[PDB]
Amino acid sequence: GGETFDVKGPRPNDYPLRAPKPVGQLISHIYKDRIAQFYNGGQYEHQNLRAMMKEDS
Amino acid sequence: VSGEPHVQLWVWHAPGQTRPSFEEAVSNQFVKTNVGEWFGPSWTTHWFRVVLTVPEHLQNKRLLEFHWDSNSEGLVWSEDGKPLQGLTGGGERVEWILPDSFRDGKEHTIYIEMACNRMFGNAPGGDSIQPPDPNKYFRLDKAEIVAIDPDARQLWIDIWILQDAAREFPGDSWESHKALQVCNEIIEAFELGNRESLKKCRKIAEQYLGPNVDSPNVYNSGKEPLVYAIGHCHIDSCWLWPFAETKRKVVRSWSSQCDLMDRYPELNFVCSQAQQYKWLKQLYPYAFERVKKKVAEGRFHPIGGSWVEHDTNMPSGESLVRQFLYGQRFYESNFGKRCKTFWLPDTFGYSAQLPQLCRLAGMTRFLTQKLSWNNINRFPHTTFNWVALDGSQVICHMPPSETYTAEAHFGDVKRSMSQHKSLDQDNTSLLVFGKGDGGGGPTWVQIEKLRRCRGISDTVGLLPRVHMGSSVDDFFDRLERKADTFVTWYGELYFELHRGTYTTQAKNKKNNRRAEAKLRDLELLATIASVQDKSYKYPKEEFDAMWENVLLCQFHDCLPGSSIEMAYRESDQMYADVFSTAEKIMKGVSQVLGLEPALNHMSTTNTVALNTLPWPRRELVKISEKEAAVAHGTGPFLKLQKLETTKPLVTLRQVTKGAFVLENSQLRVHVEKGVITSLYDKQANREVIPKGQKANQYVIFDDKPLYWQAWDVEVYHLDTRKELPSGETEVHENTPHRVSVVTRTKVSDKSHIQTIIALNGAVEGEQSWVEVQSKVDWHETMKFLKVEFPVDVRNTEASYETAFGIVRRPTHYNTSWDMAKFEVCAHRWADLSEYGYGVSILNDSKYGFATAGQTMRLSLLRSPKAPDAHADMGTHHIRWAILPHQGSLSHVTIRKAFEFNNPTKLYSSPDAAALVAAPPPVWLTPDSSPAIVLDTVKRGEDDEDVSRGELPARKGQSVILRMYDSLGGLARGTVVTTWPLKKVCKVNLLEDDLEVVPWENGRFTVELRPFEVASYRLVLALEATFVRDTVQDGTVLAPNHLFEQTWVLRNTGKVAWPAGCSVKFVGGDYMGRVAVQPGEEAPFTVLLRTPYRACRVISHWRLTTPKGTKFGHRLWCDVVVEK
Amino acid sequence: TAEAHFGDVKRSMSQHKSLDQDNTSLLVFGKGDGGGGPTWVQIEKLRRCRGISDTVGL
Amino acid sequence: WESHKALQVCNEIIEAFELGNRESLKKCRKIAEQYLGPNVDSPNVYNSGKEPLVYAIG
Amino acid sequence: RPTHYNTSWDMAKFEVCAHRWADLSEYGYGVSILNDSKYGFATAGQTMRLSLLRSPKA
Amino acid sequence: KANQYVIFDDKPLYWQAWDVEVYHLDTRKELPSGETEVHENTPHRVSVVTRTKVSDK
Ligand SMILES: [Zn+2]
């Protein structure tokens, strides 16, 4: 929790030496347009939240 | 008060352009002067003895300063001889606060050493990059004693920040309108005569800035900070001034910074370039002592870990390794710790292998802001994972405010988030503020403005919250714990500006490469000699001196050729000293290493050839100038064969009387009037030059860049292509082992070229090249001379050599991202290769290269005028070679480039038969992968006889091998040594053991991942202290738990803690939202919550007095989130 | 008849023309011109809007 | 940074929702809580005691 | 084709068309994934990925 | 582990049969249900066979 002249700092971070995989910057407008399909009544009515809205009828 | 009764100043002029020390300056004869005089030609120095007598009516004015405004820079010395504070003449830093003992009419005296040069050299005002004017004169404007109203000063800062808030906040939100209303209420409440109106106005402004903005306590509000502000002072070593002026700038800036950090308890400072620390330590011991005291005090963080803020494109791999090694060794020996952040905010481009070297030097973090200057493609990221060629990665952060000299404006804090390009992954950012490029550090104005900014963000939370008590390490530690989600960037970070920097000042680049090669050779030879003979002392003093000089000359403004003439005169002196020391070292080693005196009438049985390359070698050596021999071998010493058979290398003239055919056993070169009209490879029976084109063609362009003459070459320069036709060829050398024709080309009046094209006799199983050497008498103005080789090889990608590997670049200008690379940096060879065949242009002194669709182009000479009016005037010796090779780019090109840059030298010997027959000291087995380059053999830095006492030393003798694969594939090798081996271990660049490797008979095996730089060591035969806390480090907590951290601290100090003395979060991962006698222990508690993700989070805390100053050890909370 | 959209709450300040004198404003939501009053959707959306302003105060 | 954080929370919600399961709905609500607040689905969100700027009336 | 998503020009190529083989090779060694009925391919930093099946509905 | 079956959620923006969008790379999920056994063991060719359950049906 603090320096004691035996430890100079906290236990060192586990930052990997090699990058495992490339990750790219997410395109803003595509991701923004994706959200509306999670609840819209379009072609995904039976695969998004609208399908889960009604338990029974 | 300014008169002669109160402020009396005498002056003394330094003899020439010399810069005497304080010891020999105050012993001279000063003559009285006064305000209004003009002082000295440019670069001269003048010492002022200033005697101050604060009058009777100023003794109790609550703030007394000495305003000194000579329009140049200066340094204030006390009577004793301690540097006190810098001064600058533009009005930026003109006040020196009187040290509270002048408040009695006793007429205390100080000294002011003024340097007759502005902050940015001595250009005829306006441009600051025009060549310096030798006859500038500076006027002493004001030299008075001023009693300043502190309330007016605070109100000035307040209203300045308020006006910036009223203008820069969005016009459609209520914050800007409220700021405008507060400004109006301040204006209407201020009356000229009265002085209480100032206090009333400050009270009015408090309703928008906060209750106590004028104190450091504003940073202890405990809210989430988003922008971390760190003070910074970038002093370019030789940009627009000589090196001596830099030696002065360093002290005159760090003294001001130390004084400020005494006044403001929250200011933190970072400065790189360990070389500047060494200068300060050598020349100004008191300033270095106070700097080191600040460093131990937890402020004034030295980071960067390099000798200088070097350029990373041109210097070879060993140069980069030496930069890191010397910088880190200096930091570890002088200060306790070793830097973990690579600081490089002003470098023109970054090599693709830099992250690997950083990870091998213990530095996992990288900071830079130069890429914001790209004028074609905006760099798309702010915080990212920069991945090297081998896959090693570092965390790179580019401050969204696009400067390292941020004026700490309100706009800068706003842009630290408005221009952040990586807000998806992280929202924190670093605001680096100060006055760089040779200037002094932050001023008090900037610190007060940051205080006001944080007050604004605390009261009306629209500004991103700024924090000032933290360090760069804290910010990067917070970044490091979420770095798995950061964007990655693979390969080089190409800088799309200053592309002419690869060519300007050709002499400096040639000297740098020669020095690198000579240093490698000498280190290998000295290692062999020191291991072989125990009486020969390894010359560590001399090697350190030469390496320090070379690394200093690799500074990001010396080597890139963008400095004034005087800087290059000093750098020429530095290189001359380096080469003289190298000559001395080589003479000593040759005395010990057998005996290699000199060259005489040759005997081809008493002479050997120095190899210094780690592979079997077989070439033609030029003994007995009429004749020649074959030097072949594997060790450092090669024997000769003295061939004589049927003649290789015929040359014959066609009836055209001007065309020549130089025919080898492997090449046939048809040379027209100066150009290679045909190049036929007799091994792969194909033509290398396309039909109708002409290789090795001198072309000239008009440079005329936009602003930065010495730095930039712009894209439009490609339009003004013009071929130089004036060749007319004739025979130059016709020996049965070497032929060569010579041509003269007239660039223009008073500028001409003489080119020699030569072909050497082929040797068994060794690709032969066409060698070209040019004597260029160059006197052009704003021209750019290049040489063209069309190579009839179709490929969309060209390979260039960089530090420790190969970079790959497009050749088609498809997008702007590729049009921006119209000129690139290649070290020793550039290769254009199709599937089964390639052509490599390999040089020895040139870095600029450009491959554009079957036409390689080597940049030869530039003639800028801005910083230097005679940049490259004179005679230049340039060498290059065309190497057509069967198969794709392979070890042949690497080995040939190394051989081209390291010609063999002959050496006689009393017994040149034992020397040759002896097995080499260190070699690679022939069955090992040819991609491995055993770049350097060097003796360990701490061997009880090499140590120099800087750092703790190991016992026995040790040898460091740096081997890297150059081609990018998994390389297997077996290293054979004849030395009696005791153990072998893998080490990093700083020579710290990593793991033991097994060895059999001095035959340990090496496995290199692609583009890896593995290194092997061969060992031959108010105070406060922490007590405990409740929750330990690394304890596991619920995802959104509410807990409390309780430290207990003991005093262990003479003084006593004031009443408040709380802990106030100067750290990283925010987790907020829920007196003591020298003997006993006090517990402190903070309330924290765990963040919204499974991770490890680390928060740094610190005891602070209830007035701002922080003290004691550093505390942290370490938790893991389970989820 | 504000639909209690996020945009409506944002425009209640972005389109305020008298921010110099006062910053408070009234958001009148429902379904007017002969329609019924507010629906449960609008009330829940206003709850979410205040939650947003409390957690990330923009 | 507010819009980017909202986008990130939306992405984390989308990736945490599966059609068949019904506990994924509770998990998604818990994820959204990190941007909307602990208990947005209750009137207590209006009792935080902070300065209100827009008054909503049905 | 690139395998690193450095710029948008490379992030746009997250899935490419290969006819009969896709090869990832260093200097002296490579691995080729060669198919007989599939065209979609994606190499992203040491991980070749062959697109097998999609189930659209529109 | 090479030759690893992974599944993503497609759900493109508008053109279902045409588009697969970049964000689909985020929903990676490995199919683990293998359990290997011998299928052919001739002295010139060997081969093991595994069954992996993508989901019900
Ligand atoms: Zn600089």
Side-chain angles (χ1 to χ4, degrees), chain A, chain B residues 1-1054 1056-1109 1111-1123, chain C, chain D, chain E, chain F:
Chain A
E3 308 184 333
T4 58
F5 200 71
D6 298 315
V7 310
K8 323 318 83 183
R11 186 191 66 75
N13 291 323
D14 50 335
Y15 189 49
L17 175 68
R18 314 259 155 116
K21 57 196 254 308
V23 13
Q25 171 174 83
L26 50 99
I27 322 295
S28 213
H29 64 276
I30 286 160
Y31 275 80
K32 278 188 214 185
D33 289 28
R34 194 259 294 256
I35 308 173
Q37 96 182 1
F38 183 61
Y39 57 82
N40 275 335
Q43 40 176 337
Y44 301 112
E45 265 153 6
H46 310 285
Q47 264 76 42
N48 62 5
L49 212 36
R50 290 278 194 93
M52 301 245 46
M53 219 81 93
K54 300 172 166 28
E55 282 196 3
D56 228 310
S57 309
Chain B
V1 281
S2 69
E4 55 91 14
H6 302 305
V7 176
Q8 27 197 0
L9 40 145
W10 296 261
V11 79
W12 173 73
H13 309 261
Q17 282 188 11
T18 80
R19 300 156 173 90
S21 73
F22 178 92
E23 259 316 355
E24 55 175 316
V26 310
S27 82
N28 285 111
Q29 195 69 5
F30 291 69
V31 302
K32 171 169 314 301
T33 168
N34 34 33
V35 153
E37 310 223 330
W38 297 77
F39 288 103
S42 356
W43 311 117
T44 42
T45 136
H46 311 260
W47 283 78
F48 289 83
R49 203 212 314 282
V50 180
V51 179
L52 309 165
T53 319
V54 188
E56 199 40 86
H57 69 282
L58 285 197
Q59 315 248 327
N60 318 309
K61 279 297 212 204
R62 204 157 80 265
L63 196 45
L64 288 171
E65 289 154 336
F66 181 60
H67 276 206
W68 172 276
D69 199 342
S70 160
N71 273 272
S72 55
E73 25 185 35
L75 179 64
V76 177
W77 300 73
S78 80
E79 208 173 332
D80 322 325
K82 336 280 192 54
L84 290 191
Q85 211 209 68
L87 303 165
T88 321
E92 31 270 38
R93 201 183 323 258
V94 296
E95 64 253 353
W96 173 63
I97 295 179
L98 301 193
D100 246 342
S101 85
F102 289 21
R103 287 163 181 277
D104 40 335
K106 306 311 282 308
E107 97 161 20
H108 301 271
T109 147
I110 59 158
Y111 291 87
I112 295 187
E113 175 204 340
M114 179 225 309
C116 281
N117 68 252
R118 270 147 63 73
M119 204 80 280
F120 287 101
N122 277 319
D127 251 334
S128 81
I129 80 152
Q130 290 319 297
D133 188 0
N135 305 297
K136 263 194 148 13
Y137 274 87
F138 300 83
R139 187 179 136 135
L140 184 44
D141 269 359
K142 68 167 29 53
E144 72 255 349
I145 289 181
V146 181
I148 296 264
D149 204 4
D151 300 53
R153 190 167 265 191
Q154 297 316 305
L155 177 60
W156 168 43
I157 296 304
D158 283 2
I159 193 76
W160 195 355
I161 279 302
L162 268 164
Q163 184 260 8
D164 263 351
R167 279 182 155 302
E168 261 91 8
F169 268 170
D172 53 22
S173 185
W174 64 275
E175 283 86 15
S176 69
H177 292 283
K178 191 173 182 40
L180 183 49
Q181 164 193 324
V182 164
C183 280
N184 287 339
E185 183 160 356
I186 281 165
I187 305 312
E188 309 149 351
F190 163 90
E191 50 182 320
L192 201 43
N194 199 358
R195 291 239 176 224
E196 310 321 88
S197 63
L198 296 187
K199 261 179 287 322
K200 186 186 322 300
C201 289
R202 291 206 61 215
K203 189 152 307 310
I204 287 174
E206 142 176 350
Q207 92 177 75
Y208 193 89
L209 303 164
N212 262 287
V213 279
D214 58 77
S215 96
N217 294 329
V218 71
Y219 291 116
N220 299 329
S221 92
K223 309 228 221 320
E224 164 77 322
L226 290 195
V227 176
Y228 289 80
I230 183 82
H232 172 62
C233 170
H234 174 58
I235 304 132
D236 280 315
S237 285
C238 68
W239 183 23
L240 299 159
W241 45 85
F243 282 101
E245 195 47 43
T246 282
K247 279 166 211 194
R248 288 210 283 197
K249 285 181 182 250
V250 164
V251 54
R252 95 164 41 106
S253 147
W254 293 359
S255 321
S256 323
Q257 281 327 294
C258 290
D259 161 64
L260 270 201
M261 288 168 0
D262 278 308
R263 313 221 313 269
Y264 297 94
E266 83 268 31
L267 172 66
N268 273 18
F269 191 63
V270 290
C271 52
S272 36
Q273 303 190 76
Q275 162 78 97
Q276 289 172 358
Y277 285 93
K278 215 218 183 186
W279 277 338
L280 199 83
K281 177 183 175 184
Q282 268 162 8
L283 284 153
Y284 306 96
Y286 180 87
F288 182 74
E289 221 53 35
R290 83 187 301 208
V291 153
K292 144 177 308 183
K293 201 190 301 316
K294 289 306 173 182
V295 167
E297 243 165 40
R299 305 205 264 164
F300 204 111
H301 312 266
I303 83 191
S306 42
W307 193 246
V308 295
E309 279 199 29
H310 58 295
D311 173 305
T312 54
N313 270 333
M314 298 150 244
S316 74
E318 207 45 40
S319 275
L320 304 181
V321 180
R322 293 313 165 116
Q323 296 268 359
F324 282 149
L325 175 73
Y326 279 80
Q328 299 277 53
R329 282 185 72 76
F330 182 91
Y331 286 126
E332 190 168 347
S333 90
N334 284 276
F335 324 119
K337 58 231 186 321
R338 178 194 295 168
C339 321
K340 311 200 280 326
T341 312
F342 193 26
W343 192 266
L344 226 63
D346 207 24
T347 295
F348 318 142
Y350 314 90
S351 66
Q353 279 273 61
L354 216 51
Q356 160 156 212
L357 300 185
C358 289
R359 283 314 283 272
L360 286 178
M363 298 166 358
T364 68
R365 280 106 66 145
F366 178 69
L367 206 141
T368 158
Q369 63 89 51
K370 202 49 168 182
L371 251 59
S372 79
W373 279 34
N374 280 354
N375 62 347
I376 300 188
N377 309 292
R378 191 201 287 319
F379 190 73
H381 307 127
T382 284
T383 298
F384 59 100
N385 276 306
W386 184 20
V387 186
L389 289 182
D390 90 351
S392 301
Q393 60 168 3
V394 296
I395 301 179
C396 178
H397 176 74
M398 293 159 151
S401 61
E402 287 158 357
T403 36
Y404 59 97
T405 89
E407 284 272 46
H409 286 324
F410 182 99
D412 288 337
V413 180
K414 175 106 147 14
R415 279 189 298 278
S416 271
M417 192 88 48
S418 99
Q419 285 175 351
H420 202 303
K421 295 155 189 171
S422 317
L423 286 169
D424 305 86
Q425 291 85 27
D426 193 290
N427 52 343
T428 55
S429 89
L430 211 80
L431 172 70
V432 187
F433 71 103
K435 291 179 167 300
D437 14 69
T443 66
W444 64 269
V445 165
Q446 281 148 348
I447 294 146
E448 301 280 349
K449 275 202 279 189
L450 284 177
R451 274 173 183 181
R452 302 320 192 278
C453 281
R454 205 221 161 85
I456 279 190
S457 100
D458 274 349
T459 294
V460 299
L462 192 52
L463 253 199
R465 197 160 294 104
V466 66
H467 190 71
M468 263 268 298
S470 162
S471 60
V472 175
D473 274 20
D474 294 310
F475 164 81
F476 271 115
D477 278 354
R478 209 208 74 86
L479 276 193
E480 219 169 74
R481 270 174 308 263
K482 41 196 300 172
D484 320 332
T485 86
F486 285 164
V487 179
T488 61
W489 183 276
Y490 282 74
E492 72 188 333
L493 287 175
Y494 186 76
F495 181 47
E496 303 175 357
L497 210 69
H498 302 352
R499 294 179 202 82
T501 233
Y502 313 135
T503 324
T504 319
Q505 298 288 344
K507 204 31 162 43
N508 261 242
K509 291 158 177 56
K510 187 196 211 186
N511 278 341
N512 175 69
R513 200 179 286 187
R514 263 189 56 229
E516 276 168 357
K518 185 73 108 160
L519 263 167
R520 211 193 58 83
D521 162 2
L522 283 189
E523 247 161 52
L524 163 69
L525 283 195
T527 279
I528 293 166
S530 51
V531 169
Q532 158 182 357
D533 183 9
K534 265 33 176 181
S535 76
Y536 168 78
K537 215 43 51 163
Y538 187 81
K540 204 41 168 75
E541 288 305 340
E542 290 83 314
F543 270 136
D544 266 9
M546 320 171 18
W547 265 122
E548 286 168 356
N549 273 352
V550 165
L551 296 182
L552 169 62
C553 283
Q554 271 167 20
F555 175 74
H556 76 257
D557 266 313
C558 190
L559 180 63
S562 70
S563 294
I564 57 163
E565 263 191 285
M566 330 170 44
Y568 294 127
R569 300 288 85 79
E570 282 191 84
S571 105
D572 272 19
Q573 195 51 43
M574 254 163 244
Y575 275 125
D577 281 352
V578 154
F579 286 129
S580 94
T581 314
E583 252 326 292
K584 207 172 58 61
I585 285 182
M586 176 84 218
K587 164 185 312 305
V589 122
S590 99
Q591 198 305 332
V592 152
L593 198 40
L595 193 70
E596 307 178 11
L599 291 192
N600 307 331
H601 158 295
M602 216 78 62
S603 63
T604 166
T605 168
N606 309 7
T607 99
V608 307
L610 226 39
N611 182 14
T612 57
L613 282 192
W615 51 75
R617 219 177 152 150
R618 173 164 208 113
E619 70 165 322
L620 272 189
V621 278
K622 205 236 170 286
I623 61 64
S624 89
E625 167 279 338
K626 275 173 186 168
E627 330 308 334
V630 158
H632 77 90
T634 164
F637 320 108
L638 325 173
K639 75 193 316 297
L640 319 177
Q641 278 247 285
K642 175 211 48 43
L643 44 56
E644 196 147 66
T645 304
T646 164
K647 324 321 90 177
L649 254 291
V650 298
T651 169
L652 47 103
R653 229 165 299 87
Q654 300 335 79
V655 295
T656 61
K657 161 64 174 26
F660 292 85
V661 185
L662 327 180
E663 195 156 278
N664 195 347
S665 172
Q666 313 175 341
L667 295 174
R668 190 207 302 138
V669 192
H670 283 263
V671 177
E672 206 38 69
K673 45 186 60 59
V675 307
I676 296 168
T677 36
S678 161
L679 179 46
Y680 191 79
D681 198 337
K682 281 157 79 158
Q683 271 168 330
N685 302 79
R686 53 186 292 174
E687 201 98 35
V688 170
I689 311 310
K691 270 304 321 312
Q693 313 221 52
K694 25 194 63 178
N696 162 127
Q697 167 81 77
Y698 288 107
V699 296
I700 203 151
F701 305 83
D702 300 22
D703 214 349
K704 294 222 237 306
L706 282 181
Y707 182 88
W708 311 88
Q709 269 196 66
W711 298 255
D712 286 0
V713 50
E714 263 317 329
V715 54
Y716 50 74
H717 95 286
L718 289 170
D719 296 342
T720 49
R721 189 177 164 282
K722 193 181 79 120
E723 310 188 328
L724 311 178
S726 72
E728 199 300 298
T729 309
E730 83 214 359
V731 177
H732 175 76
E733 195 173 348
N734 200 341
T735 88
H737 65 278
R738 169 186 182 92
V739 317
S740 68
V741 303
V742 62
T743 322
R744 284 185 92 280
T745 281
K746 176 203 156 254
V747 170
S748 89
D749 328 75
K750 91 207 165 307
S751 210
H752 61 89
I753 304 182
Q754 179 193 278
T755 283
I756 296 166
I757 295 163
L759 207 43
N760 282 333
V763 280
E764 292 79 340
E766 279 267 348
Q767 183 59 228
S768 69
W769 57 56
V770 189
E771 172 178 8
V772 187
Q773 35 207 2
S774 324
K775 216 82 200 98
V776 186
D777 194 23
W778 186 241
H779 294 112
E780 285 304 291
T781 307
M782 280 141 198
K783 294 305 198 318
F784 199 169
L785 170 86
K786 309 176 156 176
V787 58
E788 279 197 283
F789 321 90
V791 286
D792 191 68
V793 165
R794 173 95 39 186
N795 200 26
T796 42
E797 57 112 16
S799 305
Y800 308 88
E801 202 213 304
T802 62
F804 290 143
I806 298 172
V807 83
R808 237 163 287 265
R809 287 168 179 137
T811 67
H812 49 52
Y813 309 155
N814 260 9
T815 62
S816 66
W817 278 99
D818 312 329
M819 177 63 138
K821 292 193 177 60
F822 63 91
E823 168 128 351
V824 312
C825 170
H827 284 210
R828 285 191 243 93
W829 54 265
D831 175 90
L832 187 52
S833 69
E834 64 193 335
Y835 161 67
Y837 200 111
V839 178
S840 316
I841 300 308
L842 46 83
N843 56 70
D844 64 350
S845 41
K846 297 297 157 177
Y847 291 88
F849 216 97
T851 312
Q854 263 172 128
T855 305
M856 308 165 120
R857 208 181 275 126
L858 178 64
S859 302
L860 289 193
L861 285 172
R862 253 170 47 97
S863 62
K865 306 281 167 207
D868 187 339
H870 305 109
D872 280 318
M873 301 331 221
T875 299
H876 300 267
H877 221 106
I878 311 166
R879 268 170 83 241
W880 63 84
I882 314 156
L883 179 90
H885 54 84
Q886 265 222 336
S888 189
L889 171 76
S890 81
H891 64 96
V892 164
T893 299
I894 319 285
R895 296 223 225 265
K896 279 317 168 190
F898 267 99
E899 281 165 43
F900 192 71
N901 280 254
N902 292 266
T904 49
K905 288 286 316 323
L906 308 141
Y907 286 95
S908 59
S909 150
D911 57 351
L915 212 68
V916 151
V922 176
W923 47 297
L924 289 146
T925 42
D927 42 302
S928 92
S929 163
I932 294 179
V933 176
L934 209 154
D935 189 62
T936 88
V937 179
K938 149 181 88 95
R939 270 203 62 135
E941 253 308 352
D942 326 295
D943 295 50
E944 190 202 23
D945 57 352
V946 179
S947 68
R948 304 234 278 141
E950 226 196 347
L951 283 162
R954 319 172 72 258
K955 290 298 305 309
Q957 299 201 111
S958 62
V959 171
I960 305 287
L961 318 172
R962 286 193 221 291
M963 41 207 321
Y964 69 101
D965 87 342
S966 39
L967 289 174
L970 179 98
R972 305 275 188 51
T974 310
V975 172
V976 178
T977 53
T978 54
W979 296 325
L981 231 57
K982 188 165 95 60
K983 91 190 282 280
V984 186
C985 37
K986 274 196 86 159
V987 298
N988 54 351
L989 296 203
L990 318 172
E991 290 135 34
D992 289 352
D993 308 37
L994 300 191
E995 57 275 23
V996 174
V997 316
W999 55 282
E1000 192 35 17
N1001 313 303
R1003 278 207 174 226
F1004 65 100
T1005 76
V1006 295
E1007 201 155 25
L1008 295 203
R1009 317 280 272 295
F1011 294 125
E1012 206 203 326
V1013 201
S1015 312
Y1016 294 84
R1017 177 202 294 287
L1018 280 54
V1019 185
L1020 321 176
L1022 314 97
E1023 313 310 57
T1025 198
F1026 175 75
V1027 177
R1028 74 197 222 287
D1029 40 357
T1030 25
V1031 299
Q1032 279 88 301
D1033 281 359
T1035 205
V1036 291
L1037 290 183
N1040 202 96
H1041 210 274
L1042 232 54
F1043 75 126
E1044 73 289 60
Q1045 165 77 21
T1046 40
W1047 300 278
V1048 296
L1049 282 99
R1050 193 188 315 279
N1051 191 320
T1052 78
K1054 323 322 311 199
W1057 295 350
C1061 63
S1062 56
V1063 267
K1064 284 310 179 58
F1065 184 65
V1066 295
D1069 267 317
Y1070 168 114
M1071 313 183 21
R1073 313 226 70 264
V1074 323
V1076 180
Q1077 322 356 287
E1080 70 273 327
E1081 316 171 28
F1084 305 89
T1085 305
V1086 277
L1087 308 164
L1088 313 154
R1089 83 157 149 181
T1090 352
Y1092 273 116
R1093 54 169 152 111
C1095 56
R1096 219 180 61 136
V1097 280
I1098 289 198
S1099 39
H1100 294 193
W1101 304 79
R1102 210 142 150 76
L1103 258 303
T1104 178
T1105 88
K1107 82 165 295 186
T1109 311
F1111 67 92
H1113 280 161
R1114 297 180 297 89
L1115 310 153
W1116 58 82
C1117 193
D1118 215 74
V1119 277
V1120 160
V1121 202
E1122 168 260 5
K1123 184 95 215 57
Chain C
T1 89
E3 284 272 46
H5 286 324
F6 182 99
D8 288 337
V9 180
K10 175 106 147 14
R11 279 189 298 278
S12 271
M13 192 88 48
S14 99
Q15 285 175 351
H16 202 303
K17 295 156 189 171
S18 317
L19 286 169
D20 305 86
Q21 291 85 27
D22 193 290
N23 52 343
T24 55
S25 89
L26 211 80
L27 172 70
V28 187
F29 71 103
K31 291 179 167 300
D33 14 69
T39 66
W40 64 269
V41 165
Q42 281 148 348
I43 294 146
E44 301 280 349
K45 275 202 279 189
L46 284 177
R47 274 173 183 181
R48 302 320 192 278
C49 281
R50 205 221 161 85
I52 279 190
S53 100
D54 274 348
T55 294
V56 299
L58 192 52
Chain D
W1 64 275
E2 283 86 15
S3 69
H4 292 283
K5 191 173 182 39
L7 183 49
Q8 164 193 324
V9 164
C10 280
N11 287 339
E12 183 160 356
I13 281 165
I14 305 312
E15 309 149 351
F17 163 90
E18 50 182 320
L19 201 43
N21 199 358
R22 291 239 176 224
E23 310 321 88
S24 63
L25 296 187
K26 261 179 287 322
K27 186 186 322 300
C28 289
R29 291 206 61 215
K30 189 152 307 310
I31 287 174
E33 142 176 350
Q34 92 177 75
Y35 193 89
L36 303 164
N39 262 287
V40 279
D41 58 77
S42 96
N44 294 329
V45 71
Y46 291 116
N47 299 329
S48 92
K50 309 228 221 320
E51 164 77 322
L53 290 195
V54 176
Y55 289 80
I57 183 82
Chain E
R1 287 168 179 137
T3 67
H4 49 52
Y5 309 155
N6 260 9
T7 62
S8 66
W9 278 99
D10 312 329
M11 177 63 138
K13 292 193 177 60
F14 63 91
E15 168 128 351
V16 312
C17 170
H19 284 210
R20 285 191 243 93
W21 54 265
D23 175 90
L24 187 52
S25 69
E26 64 193 335
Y27 161 67
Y29 200 111
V31 178
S32 316
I33 300 308
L34 46 83
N35 56 70
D36 64 350
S37 41
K38 297 297 157 177
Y39 291 88
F41 216 97
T43 312
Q46 263 172 128
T47 305
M48 308 165 120
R49 208 182 275 126
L50 178 64
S51 302
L52 288 193
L53 285 172
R54 253 170 47 97
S55 62
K57 306 281 167 207
Chain F
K1 25 194 63 178
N3 162 127
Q4 167 81 77
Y5 288 107
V6 296
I7 203 151
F8 305 83
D9 300 22
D10 214 349
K11 294 222 237 306
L13 282 181
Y14 182 88
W15 311 88
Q16 269 197 66
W18 298 255
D19 286 0
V20 50
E21 263 318 329
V22 54
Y23 50 74
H24 96 286
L25 289 170
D26 296 342
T27 49
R28 189 177 164 282
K29 193 181 79 120
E30 310 188 328
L31 311 178
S33 72
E35 199 300 298
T36 309
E37 83 214 359
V38 177
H39 175 76
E40 195 173 348
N41 200 341
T42 88
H44 66 278
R45 169 187 183 92
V46 317
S47 68
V48 303
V49 62
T50 322
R51 284 185 92 280
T52 281
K53 176 203 156 254
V54 170
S55 89
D56 328 75
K57 91 207 165 307

